[PDB]
Design a protein around this ligand. Structure first.
Ligand SMILES: CCc1[nH]c2nc(Oc3cncnc3)nc(N3C[C@@H]4[C@@H](N)[C@@H]4C3)c2c1Cl
Length: 193
């Protein structure tokens, strides 16, 4: 299973250098983009947290949380724990920690993983009026031995390209790191222009 990803990350993310570090972001963001393509997500936020961890927030439908017949597990758990827009489990495997919050049907469903391994069963932690998925992950320095430090400009450049290629999408990139806080928001207009 996912243990293979931790032992041979080069086969799954191409490189364990800074390039691989940044690749993790796109492996999550691509799923939010897919949900925008499906017609449900309108806005995506990418956040570099103060500790070089990453948060991706969308306002789509939220990852399905119902038990699947084949696995006996919630769909969202399988997304992050089973090797397969199929890279979520790879990001999980290569992170010290990943937490997912699914905002759906007035409830917040929460699960966390540590180096790919489930901490506890999916749980409702809050009520909510919004919908969407929030994924937060801390890249594992055991994997990313060269660097775990994010390049804001590199991320922003691709975020801008993604906004353009997905005309109509609102997508932002934010840096919350000490002494360099910044935010750039992108939105290319559709027929309303
Ligand atoms: C914040 C990141 C995000 N947003 C996401 N938003 C959705 O939205 C839906 C909701 N309902 C059905 N399909 C996708 N799905 C997701 N997944 C379902 C399955 C894709 N192949 C994996 C990840 C995700 C993911 Cl991962």
């Amino acid at each position: 299973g996912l243990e293979a990803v931790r032992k041979r990350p080069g086969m799954y993310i191409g490189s364990t250098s800074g390039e691989g570090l940044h690749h993790l972001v796109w492996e999550i963001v691509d799923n939010s983009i897919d949900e925008a393509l499906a017609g449900f997500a309108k806005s995506i936020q990418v956040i570099i947290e103060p500790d070089d961890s990453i948060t991706v927030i969308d306002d789509g439908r939220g990852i399905p949380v119902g038990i699947q017949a084949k696995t006996g597990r919630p769909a969202v758990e399988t997304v992050f724990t089973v090797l397969h827009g199929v890279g979520s489990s790879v990001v999980n495997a290569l992170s010290t920690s990943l937490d997912v919050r699914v905002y759906k049907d007035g409830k917040v469903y929460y699960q966390e993983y540590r180096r790919g391994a489930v901490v506890d069963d999916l749980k409702v932690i809050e009520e909510t009026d919004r919908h969407g998925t929030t994924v937060h992950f801390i890249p594992d320095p055991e994997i990313f031995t060269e660097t775990t430090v994010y390049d804001f400009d590199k991320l922003a450049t691709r975020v801008r390209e993604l906004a353009f290629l997905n005309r109509g999408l609102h997508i932002s990139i934010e840096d919350r790191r000490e002494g360099q806080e910044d935010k750039k928001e992108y939105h290319y207009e559709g027929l309303e222009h």
